[PDB]
Each structure stands twice: as C-alpha cells, then as structure tokens.
C-alpha cells in the first residue's frame, strides 16, 4: 500500500499508454472534445463528442488487462439523439447503476449564453451490466419533479464526476446568480500584498466578463434516491472560503473521506482542492498548496495569486492517495500561458515529489482527469489527457495508467 514519500530524482514513474484498450478514444480523422471520465468501486463512465456528429455516454469495468495493468472495458454505450442539445454531463455511480446528469440547451453552451439558456436538465440512469431485452433498465431517463435552486436563477452540473453517500447522489454543479443580487463586500478581496490589484477585482471576476449578467458559484446538486418514486435535485452552494468563479469542480472519495477540487478559471492560479468538512452545507478545507498551478493567459498566467479581472484557465485535477502525508497525483501542464506539455506529477502541499513527462514540451494538451484506485493492494492511477495529434490536426483524449511506486529506486 505505502508509496514513495520523499522527493526523488530517479524516473520512478513509468506511465503506460492504454488508449487503444478503450477503442472509442482512438479514431482516424475525427475531432473529439468535451471529455468525461468517472470511476467508482469497480466500474467507470466515459463521454465525448465526435465533432456525423455524435454524443457517446458509456459505462464499463476497470479490469486487469492481463499484465497486472488496469484498463477500461466498455459494457454499455448510449448514443443520445440530438447531440447539439446535450452539454455539461456529470456522472455518479450507485448500486449497479451509473447516473449521468446533463444539461439540455438550444442556445449553445449555457456558460456562453447564460441569459437565453432554457435551464432544462436531464438525468439518465445507465446499467453497468445491461440485460438483453431490457427496457427501463439498460438506460432510462429519470423524471425530476423539481429543481431547487434557492435565490439562484439557474443551476447546472459543472464537473466530470461525483460521489454517493448511502442512497443520495452528489453531482458537482454551479449556480447562476443575477449579479445585482450578488452580495459581496469588496474589502474581503485580498489586495493587501498586491499593489496592482483593486477591491472590485475578485467581485467582478465572479462572471466571465466584468459586465456579465450572471455570476457563477460552484457547488453541489443533490439527488436522494429514497425521496419518493420521482426524486428532485437541490442545489448546495459552496462556501465563501477562498471564493473563485464557478468552475468545473469534482468531488471524489479517497481513503474514506470525500475530497473536493475546483478548477482555477480566475486569478487564484494556485490549485484549489482539499478534504471536505461538510457536504451540506458545502465547506472544503482547501489545501495551502504553493507548487501546482495551471496555465492561463496574459493577465492571469500560471502561479498568479493577485486578484485580477480575468476568466482564464484549464481543468487539471488531482487525486489524494495518502491522506496521512497528503500526497496527491495528477497530470498538469508545464506551461505558463499555453496549454502545452502534460506532466504526471506527484506532490505534497509545498513540494513536487516525482514527475514524468507524458509527451513533448510543446505538445498541445488541455483537460486532464485523474482518478486513482487499488489493484491487488497496489496503488494505480488512470489519467485522461486531452492531447492534440501532430498529424491528424485534431485534438483527442488519451488514457495513461501510472503506478505509484512503493520504493524510491
């Protein structure tokens, strides 16, 4: 179980490409965007867009491929009709079923067309082991009696994966609040050690533009399966501790405690994750990490810590593997202002322990989704790295299986 706990120089990480084990990831002459990779217990869920446009939402098993290396094996694929309307899927597993919450819009991405968005959501329940001649079991679109959002005007899932606590599901989500109704005292903006900042920066940066109609607040969507035959979804806003713009977040189980991660799309370049103190209301004990950040743009580049007016960043999450020392793993982009050079990194709060470069220093790489698990009492991690192929001129996901070494030699 125990891993290498100290900073070392030897290339102990030996990532293995398992992309062709998942045959849908790899196709010739096709652009594949908006990926989702979610795992829990023994199964997983996956989604992408073949932009003959097609949306694919599938589930399967994480099994030993043979040489004691895990790989994803698909057990059920769903092709939802009208792929132009389906946006921002989020996946949670519970009791031999996978629940995929997803938004429906006829005005494009609701993030970019916030005012015109219909607000309609849809929830589909996929079976991990589908029955032949199985209606209402293989895949079945559930009915939501109501969507409780409070003072927020609209809510929407905004993240790859979530957790289940007993009989209740918790999707990562975000709340659309009218900016006029947003209550904020600009004195809370940490412009103390930032002489080029202003009090109104992080308040105006709660929307994609300073003059934005809405503001984005990350949080959770709650689905209690034991709440009548037709349960409802309730929104749970994240606390004001280290508040940032509503970004694609992720909540996952790790060693018997849920962990929360929020993407850095604002000025808070440093990674925003940590153990969850309370699920309802949401309170995340953020790490005080000072070594992992994400590539942004010109005004909010990597490692920026000063409140600025910006909406720049990329989604690179981490997975806690040793809570005692708080050692996490994730594929991050070694770049300041471009989405380039993905590196699998194992790090503590103030020290990068060991790393391994997945590609070349100038390889286009955007989204990264990392989940870790055990395989015969050994700690493995499967990461999904959006990578641009040099030849096909089309971005594409890639699946890497990295084992966390036990020794440091």
């Amino acid at each position, epitope marked *: 179980n125990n891993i290498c706990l100290q900073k070392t120089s030897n290339q102990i990480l030996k990532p293995k490409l398992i992309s062709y084990t998942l045959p849908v990831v790899g196709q010739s002459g096709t652009c594949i965007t908006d990926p989702l990779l979610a795992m829990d217990e023994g199964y997983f869920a996956y989604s992408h867009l073949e932009r003959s446009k097609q949306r694919i939402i599938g589930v399967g098993e994480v099994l030993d491929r043979g040489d004691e290396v895990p790989s994803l094996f698909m057990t059920n694929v769903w092709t939802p009709p009208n792929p132009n309307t389906v946006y921002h899927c989020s996946a949670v597993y519970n009791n031999e079923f996978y629940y995929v919450l997803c938004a429906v819009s006829t005005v494009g991405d609701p993030i970019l067309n916030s005012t015109y968005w219909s607000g309609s959501l849809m929830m589909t329940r996929l079976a991990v082991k589908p029955k032949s001649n199985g209606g209402g079991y293989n895949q079945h679109q559930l009915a939501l009696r109501s969507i409780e959002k409070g003072r927020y005007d609209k809510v929407m899932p905004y993240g790859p994966s979530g957790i289940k606590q007993g009989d209740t599901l918790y999707f990562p989500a975000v709340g659309f609040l009218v900016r006029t109704e947003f209550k904020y005292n600009d004195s809370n903006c940490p412009i103390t050690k930032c002489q080029y900042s202003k009090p109104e920066n992080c308040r105006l940066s709660m929307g*994609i533009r300073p003059n934005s109609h809405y503001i984005l607040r990350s949080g959770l969507l709650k689905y209690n399966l034991s709440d009548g035959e037709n349960p409802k979804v309730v929104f749970i806003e994240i606390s004001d501790q280290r508040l940032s713009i509503g970004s694609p977040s992720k909540i996952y189980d790790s060693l018997g405690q849920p962990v929360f991660y929020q993407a850095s799309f604002s000025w808070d370049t440093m990674i925003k994750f940590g153990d969850v103190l309370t699920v309802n209301p949401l309170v995340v004990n953020w790490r005080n990490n000072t070594v992992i950040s994400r590539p942004g743009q*010109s*005004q909010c580049p990597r490692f*920026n810590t000063c409140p*600025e007016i910006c909406w720049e960043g990329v989604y690179n999450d981490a997975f806690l593997i040793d809570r005692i020392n708080w050692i996490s793993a994730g594929v991050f982009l070694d*770049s*300041n*202002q*471009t989405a380039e050079n993905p590196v699998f990194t194992v790090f503590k709060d103030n020290e990068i322990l060991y790393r391994a470069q997945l590609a070349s220093e100038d390889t286009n790489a955007q989204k990264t989704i990392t989940n870790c698990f055990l395989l015969k009492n050994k700690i493995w991690c499967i990461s999904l790295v959006e990578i641009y192929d040099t030849g096909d001129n089309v971005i594409r996901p890639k699946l890497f299986a990295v084992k966390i070494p036990e020794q440091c030699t």
Partner: antibody
Amino acid sequence: EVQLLESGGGLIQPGGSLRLSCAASGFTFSRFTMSWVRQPPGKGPEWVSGISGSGGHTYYADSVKGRFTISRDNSKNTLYLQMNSLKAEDTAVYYCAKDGFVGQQLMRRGPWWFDPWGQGTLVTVSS
Amino acid sequence: SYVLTQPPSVSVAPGQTARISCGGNNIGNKGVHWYQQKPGQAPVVVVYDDSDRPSGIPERFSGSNSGNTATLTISRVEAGDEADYYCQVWDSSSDHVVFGGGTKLTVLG
C-alpha cells in the same frame, strides 16, 4: 479609432538612460496587454517587453533583461519603457503594440498578437 | 529560444496565388500570426490564430497551419500587395514571442 502615439526617442551615449512614452486612445487601456516591439533599420521586428492590463505582470526579453523596465499608468492611458545601460545594439525604431484579441475565452492558441501598431520612435545609441 | 525561419523573398505574377512559408519546429502546436509592412508604414496584421482574418482584411488573405510549416497564401495577388511579411508566435519554452526573418514579396510584370 484606436491610435498609439510613441515619443521620447532620440540620441544617447552607450550606457545612458532613455524612457519612451506611448499615448493610447480609442480603447479601454486598462483592459489590454501592452508591449514594446523594436525594429532595427532595415531588419525584422523584435519584442522588447510587455505588461499586463493591470500592470501586475511584466514580461521582458532575454536581450534586455536587467536593463529595460516596462511600466504603465492606466489613469493617464499611457505606456512607458525605462531603458538603462544602453548598448549600441539597441539602436532601433521602437513600436508600441496593443494586444488585439477581444472576447471571453479560457485559452488562446496565440496569447500574444498585436493590433494595432504605433508609428515607432527612433532611438540611436551612439558615441 | 524558439526559431522561425522565413524565405528571404518571394516573386509571384499578378492574379496568381502567392504562398509564403513560415518554418518552425513542430509549428502545428503553435498559433501563428501574420503582419504585413509596406515601406514607411507600421506593420498591419492580416492573419491571426493560424487562420482567422481581422476585420477589414481582404478575404483573399488566408492562413493555414499544419505540421512543421504554416503558409500564408495570398490569392489573386495585386500590385499593392508588394510588402514585407512576418510570421509571429509565442514560445512558451521561454515566454518570448518570436518573429521571422521576413519575406519581401515582389510582384512581377
């Protein structure tokens, strides 16, 4: 329209000082990233420095690192460039360039491109 | 650090197409921009983000990027197109923007 008006160029000993000013009109000056691109007579352009919209982040080139210092006054809608320890190589026309990108994106395949350019200011480092 | 290589000069006949090569190590993974500079004038941008054209730029100006070379193709070359062209990029290996040597396009006839 948008226009950049450089000034402050001239004639200076090697190792001397010189500060150029760039007056900007036609856009919200605080919202954009400004840069200094210099071009020797009869040669290609070269990027000297750059500064974020709020002035929090300053980016220099290795050729002028430690000798040039970029600054910005968003209230006066003006961009500066303090040149110290000038070498005879620095003799060039100095343009003032504004980042031309406008929109709400998360990542830019080209985070740096210029629109428009100024009209340059002549700087001659000679004895 | 990063290196952009441009051929020194290009000659094309009027009405035909003129293709300006911009070479760079794995330049496909990089956003290439194009600047036209007529004599005594400041450089004007004619193509940005590989293929996007600025407002007011003639539609016959088109940029393409694939592999180790991005080519700015000037379709239906006119007499006024006689200018110096520079491709530009951002090198995230040193946080510099890099230009090319330039290409003086002379129109024949």
